[PDB]
Design a protein around this nucleic acid. Structure first.
Ligand code: MG
Ligand code: ZN
Ligand code: ZN
Length: 1269
DNA sequence: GAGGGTATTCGCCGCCTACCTCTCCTAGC
DNA sequence: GCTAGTGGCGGCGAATACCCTC
RNA sequence: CGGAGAGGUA
């Protein structure tokens, strides 16, 4: 189509290659297994590197050397024969090998299912025997001629059989006469009875040998006749002697062969139309296992019939040879070559082919030629796919060689290693340290790394400023780091954004852009407020630096990716660039009121006025400086630049407003005034202690009510203040600060008494081992709880450890109890708790037998963490692949469908109680219908963001359920619409028209997978994986399918649950339910004669998603999956909005399984996209309506990912070989419409700024501005 | 003998990202 | 220096090997 | 800088 490659690509088509195509690609034949000569280091003629085939190895030079100049361009030498051109041609030209005998392609013979087996209806064992010269096969037979000749051959064989058996009978009669002669011989004298019996035994055993000879000969002839009369094509005849007799006796009437030539002949004499008709007939009739087999056979046969591709491409008469530059051979230090693996395999193929050709030409017996053909077959199989059949062809070191099929597969294959990822220029790396002085949009960049990244710009500026005369002088000056380059570098790097990235890149904010500023040193200075987004600490981490070059790239880095523009988490909307650790401690210390402190407010005592009231915060600061006042002492202050709270403002000023400069008396501490002076001017005064949650709420309010620049400046100011006041907060660690509970011994003795009583009861006969273990795990659990409570009560409120934990900065109280109380219960290699506790704390020091088990547990945890981090990445990759083409495409589909969210179900006594999980279900959603209460007017209009004010108004009005728009019900053909998706969690506004929401959903789901532990029902990451893979749950719990009463039965190892429907049409029963599982409690436990719902879950466990779809419908399975995943994630304390899970679940429900094909071309049991199915049915009903009937189906992420319309995307994901062979057989054409495909071919992705409406903007000055010039 | 089921059994596919340092590379005539 | 060649495990689907009547 | 192996960092 487009020759080598030229822009305006339209499609990428694949198919089977014929021998004619292979010989057309070829520039010449390879017929010598010689790579390079050692005496001259030049390619050998007709070898794997021959220059007459693959082109010159030097620019405009010939092998002989007659022409060695650019003038002799395009002329083929008359002596050497190598065309004079550039040396890059060796990367493009291919050769070929002319095989002496036909060979099969291993992909279409050995790959399960064997496609040759389906095409020819031969079992894989028959193909194994025939292909590798182990059994003959009948290729043809002449029926009419053989029948007409049989009409006489029957009599002829009868005649010869009669002749043979009559000769045998004559021989036996002669033997009888000889027996009579022997009788006379032994009767001539006095013989022995035993001697008579011995001679009789000899005679009769010879006679029986004759009888057995007759029987065996007749069996041979009868078998030959039976084989011939019912002989048919595609029959294997082992026992070469039988086939030899068949051909000798009946040379004509048929043709038998062996090897790949026989398969080629069979494919030649094979009409596809008749086979397809027979398969379709067997499908429409018959039913059963035959129909099941015919379905697959027809799949392959229709694949070969619909297209204009012949099936004769499975047998190869020639082998292409890859260009030399793609399989180079290098030389080790000294001059010894390290040959590649491809060269060795090509060499073996060439050797075997040449020797086979020699034997064939010279003449040889059948056996040797067949052996050589088999070895050639095996050599070509090893070349194409090494190790698929038989032992791998190994090289030195007993390691299997690489094949052509290993260059495309795996984590190190072509796709995932070279096309989906690359190594790039203008990039560096070093260690990261902390720069507190930076701002949220700045980073410190080492001078030596900046000089190298910005080398061309510095050279250009050096030439411009007359420091060098040409570019070479400037380049040398930069290489030598002369003192004149730093001054120009300072100005060159000004306002040039730089991208920073830290691996692993779990979510979007792992890459962010900053404004570089040169620093002294070799480590990068990172802002403290981006560590959470990067997940970076400063114990040795390293980061990578990338430099955008073009104007568009700089614009993207400066607008889309700037660090100060990404404050909120895209997964949940919570702020990520907010104070933590030291900053939280400092702010918590500052904004704390300690009763009875210095300079505290004092009411009038009847002899002096009130004490502790100040006329301004400046006076309070002066008093604090003098040491008369404390920053944490309650006072009365007059404030004029701080806005009063809502209550004070309403009851003090009214209507008009605060109008900065109005004085009001505040009753707070000085630290709170200092904290409130760090917030925007119009923000109401906050009088509270700043726990981390209070700060998070403040930041969320600022983000949702102010522009992001104000938020960035506010977080910078809070960082400064927190770091300043954490130094003066007086938090340290000393063994005097680690207080021990004052009565640990008493509690331990009290519970040891209980343990002793239980142990003695066990010693007596009252309870078995398990009861004792459970009782001892209890008692000790309560002892640990009581010790923790005593420890908490003992500690003062201002202890550094208590302050750090309670401030929300970091840590929890379990660690505090372990450090100062007692560790408690440990776990056995199976996970169960040991009945013996660890009564020592790390302040006292564990003993040697309490340390051994502790180390056991710690190492077990570390290993589990490693396995979990390995397991989460695979799920993230699958999630990304399944939903990579879900992109916002419209603004509104104007659909009337939606979903209902509970939104604070009501109380029984009568009251509205807010649903706990409301921010991940109801917020950031658009209304689908107007909300009305008790026939009143609408409370919230259709198409409302439905934020906090809207939800509060809805709750006040007394309405619980509201219908909202969801992607599950979006009507857009491709992608989704902005209104259905709703608010963007990162931005806080309606999502844009180019936003790629599938990748965001995948990254949001997959990122918190390590926190979510991998803990007979699955309960963690395995549970999530089985939910997303649509597998059978494991502990499957049956669900009813028709409302009615139940006749529960009680028994051992089985329960009989019978559904007696209200209609009574039929009764369903479940009898295999093992007694291990309990019975679910719904509405009291399930009991006999109890009415149940249609979708009720009878037992206790996890219901499979496939039954709920078959019984209740798609919406029910959607809500089921969303609820299950959300609960699995909530159990660990992770908040993800439901829209991401909805995106994934939408991607999982997109196809329908066919039942009746009708006039349509869809085969039964095929998965067809719902839109395509509906379009085909609507087209068909117009003309001779015979519409197909289909049913909804649920597919896992892997199946939905591998059932794509692009063979390139599917091959770059998994199972490259199977996908490629199927695509080649079906002759699939790839329309390059997708993110991964455009990434592979190096084109602008169809999302974001690469969309047509954005990339085609036209810019021009206004007429007035143009005139003003 | 001949349709209807098997009914395990075996083979193939999958198993996180980024970086740094160092040693060795065929046997026989 | 040159020439030749008996320490992974789960999930899924096709395939033999096996009756089971019939 | 082609391949194999060993060790280490986050
Ligand atoms: Mg670290
Ligand atoms: Zn020449
Ligand atoms: Zn929509």
């Amino acid at each position: 189509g487009a020759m080598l490659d030229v822009n305006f690509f339209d499609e990428l088509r694949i198919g089977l290659a014929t021998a004619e195509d292979i010989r057309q690609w070829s520039y010449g034949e390879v017929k010598k297994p010689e790579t390079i000569n050692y005496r001259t280091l030049k390619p050998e003629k007709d070898g794997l590197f021959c220059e007459k085939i693959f082109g010159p190895t030097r620019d405009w030079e010939c092998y002989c050397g007659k022409y060695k100049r650019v003038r002799f361009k395009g002329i083929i030498c008359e002596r050497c024969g190598v065309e004079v051109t550039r040396a890059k041609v060796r990367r493009e030209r291919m050769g070929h090998i002319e095989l002496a005998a036909p060979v099969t392609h291993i992909w279409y013979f050995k790959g399960v299912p064997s496609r040759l087996g389906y095409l020819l209806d031969l079992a894989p064992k028959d193909l194994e025997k025939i292909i590798y010269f182990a059994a003959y096969v009948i290729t043809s037979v002449d029926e009419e001629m053989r029948h007409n000749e049989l009409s006489t051959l029957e009599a002829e064989m009868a005649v010869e059989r009669k002749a043979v058996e009559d000769q045998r009978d004559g021989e036996l009669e002669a033997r009888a006469q000889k027996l009579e002669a022997d009788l006379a011989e032994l009767e001539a004298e006095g013989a022995k009875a035993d001697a008579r019996r011995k001679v009789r035994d000899g005679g009769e055993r010879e006679m029986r040998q004759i009888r057995d000879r007759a029987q065996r000969e007749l069996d041979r002839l009868e078998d030959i006749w039976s084989t011939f009369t019912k002989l048919a094509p595609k029959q294997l005849i082992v026992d070469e002697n039988l086939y030899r007799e068949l051909v000798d006796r009946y040379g004509e009437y048929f043709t038998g062969a062996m090897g790949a030539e026989s398969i080629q002949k069979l494919i030649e004499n094979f009409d596809i139309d008749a086979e397809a008709e027979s398969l379709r007939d067997v499908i429409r009739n018959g039913k059963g296992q035959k129909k099941l087999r015919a379905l697959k056979r027809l799949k392959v046969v229709a694949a070969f019939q619909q297209s204009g591709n012949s099936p004769m491409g499975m047998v190869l008469d020639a082998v292409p040879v890859i260009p030399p530059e793609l399989r180079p051979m290098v030389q080790l230090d000294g001059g010894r070559f390290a040959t590649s693996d491809l060269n060795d395999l090509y060499r073996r193929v060439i050797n075997r082919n040449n020797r086979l050709k020699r034997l064939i030409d010279l003449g040889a017996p059948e056996i040797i030629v067949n052996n050589e053909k088999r070895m050639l077959q095996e050599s070509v199989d090893a070349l194409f796919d090494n190790g698929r059949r038989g032992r791998p062809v190994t090289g030195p070191g007993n390691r299997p060689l690489k094949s052509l099929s290993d260059l495309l597969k795996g984590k190190q294959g072509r796709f995932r290693q070279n096309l989906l990822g690359k190594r790039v220029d203008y990039s560096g790396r070093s260690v990261i340290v902390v720069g507190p002085q930076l701002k949220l949009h700045q980073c410190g960049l080492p001078k030596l790394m900046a000089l190298e990244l910005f080398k061309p710009f510095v050279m250009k500026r050096l030439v411009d400023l007359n420091h060098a005369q040409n570019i070479k002088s400037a380049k040398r000056m930069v290489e030598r780091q002369r003192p004149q380059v730093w001054d120009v570098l300072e100005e060159v790097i000004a306002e040039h954004p730089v991208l920073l990235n830290r691996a692993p890149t779990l979510h979007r904010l792992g890459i962010q852009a900053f404004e570089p500023m040169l620093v002294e040193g070799k480590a990068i200075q990172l802002h403290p407020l981006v560590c959470e987004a990067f997940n970076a600490d400063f114990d040795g981490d390293q980061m990578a630096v990338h430099l955008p070059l073009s104007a568009e790239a700089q614009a993207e880095a400066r607008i889309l990716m700037l660090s100060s523009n990404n404050i909120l988490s895209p997964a949940s909307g919570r702020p990520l660039a907010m104070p933590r650790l030291d900053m939280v401690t400092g702010l918590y210390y500052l904004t704390t009121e300690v009763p009875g402190d210095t300079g505290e407010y004092q009411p009038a005592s009847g002899d002096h006025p009130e004490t502790g009231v100040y006329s301004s915060p400046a006076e309070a600061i002066m008093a604090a400086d003098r040491g008369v006042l404390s920053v944490r002492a309650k006072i009365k202050v007059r404030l004029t630049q701080l806005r009063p709270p809502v209550e004070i403002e309403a009851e003090l000023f009214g209507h008009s407003g605060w109008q900065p400069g109005d004085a009001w008396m505040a009753e707070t501490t000085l630290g709170r005034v200092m904290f409130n002076e760090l917030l925007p001017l119009g923000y109401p005064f906050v009088n509270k202690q700043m726990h981390k949650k209070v700060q998070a709420a403040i930041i969320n309010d600022l983000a949702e009510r102010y522009p992001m620049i104000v938020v960035a400046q506010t977080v910078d100011k809070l960082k400064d203040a927190g770091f300043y006041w954490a130094t003066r907060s007086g938090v340290t660690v000393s063994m005097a600060d680690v207080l021990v509970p004052p009565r640990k011994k008493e509690i331990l003795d009290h519970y040891e008494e209980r343990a002793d009583k239980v142990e003695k009861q066990f010693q007596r006969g009252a309870l078995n081992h398990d009861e004792r273990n459970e009782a001892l795990v209890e008692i000790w659990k309560e002892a640990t709880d009581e010790v923790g409570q005593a420890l908490r009560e003992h500690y003062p409120d201002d202890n550094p450890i208590i302050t750090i934990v309670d401030s929300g900065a970091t840590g929890n109280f379990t660690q505090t109890r372990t450090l100062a109380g007692m560790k408690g219960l440990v776990t056995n290699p199976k996970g169960e708790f040991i009945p013996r506790p660890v009564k020592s704390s790390f302040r006292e020091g564990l003993t040697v037998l309490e340390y051994f088990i502790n180390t056991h547990g710690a190492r077990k945890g570390l290993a589990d963490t490693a396995l979990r981090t390995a397991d989460s990445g695979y799920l993230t990759r699958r999630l990304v692949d399944v939903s990579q083409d879900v992109i916002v495409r419209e603004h509104d589909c104007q659909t009337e469908r939606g979903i209902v969210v509970e939104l604070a179900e009501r109380a029984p006594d009568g009251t509205l109680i807010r649903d706990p999980y409301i921010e991940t279900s109801a917020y950031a959603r658009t209304l689908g219908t107007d909300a009305v209460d008790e026939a009143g007017n609408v409370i919230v209009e259709r198409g409302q963001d439905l934020g906090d004010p809207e939800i509060d108004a809805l709750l006040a009005a007394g309405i619980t359920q509201v219908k909202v728009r969801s992607v599950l019900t979006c009507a857009t053909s491709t992608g989704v619409c902005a209104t259905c998706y709703g608010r963007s969690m990162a931005t806080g506004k309606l999502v844009d028209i180019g936003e790629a929401v599938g990748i965001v959903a995948a990254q949001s789901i997959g990122e918190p997978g390590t926190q979510l532990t991998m803990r007979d029902i699955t309960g963690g990451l395995p549970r999530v994986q089985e939910l997303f893979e649509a597998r059978v749950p494991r502990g499957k719990a049956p669900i009813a399918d028709v409302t009615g009463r139940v006749r529960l039965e009680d028994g051992e190892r089985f329960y009989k649950i019978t559904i007696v429907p209200d209609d009574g049409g039929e009764e369903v029963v479940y009898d295999k339910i093992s007694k291990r599982q309990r019975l679910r409690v719904f509405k009291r436990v399930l009991s006999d004669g109890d009415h149940v719902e249609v979708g009720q879950q009878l037992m206790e466990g996890s219901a499979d998603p496939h039954e709920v779809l078959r019984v209740q419908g798609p919406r029910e399975v959607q809500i089921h999956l969303v609820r299950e995943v959300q609960e699995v994630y909530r159990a660990q304390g992770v908040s993800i909005h439901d829209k991401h899970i909805e995106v994934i679940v939408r991607q999982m429900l997109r196809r329908v399984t066919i039942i009746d094909s009708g006039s349509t071309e869809f085969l039964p049991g095929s998965l067809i996209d719902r839109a395509e199915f509906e379009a085909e049915n609507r087209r068909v009903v117009a003309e001779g309506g015979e519409p197909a009937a289909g049913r909804p189906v649920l597919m896992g992420i892997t199946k939905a990912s591998l059932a794509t319309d692009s063979w390139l995307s599917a091959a770059s994901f998994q199972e490259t070989t199977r996908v490629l062979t199927d695509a080649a057989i079906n002759c699939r054409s790839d329309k390059l419409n997708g993110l991964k495909e455009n990434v592979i071919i190096g084109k602008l992705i169809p999302a974001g700024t690469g969309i047509n409406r954005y990339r085609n903007i036209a810019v021009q000055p206004t007429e007035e501005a143009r005139a003003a010039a």
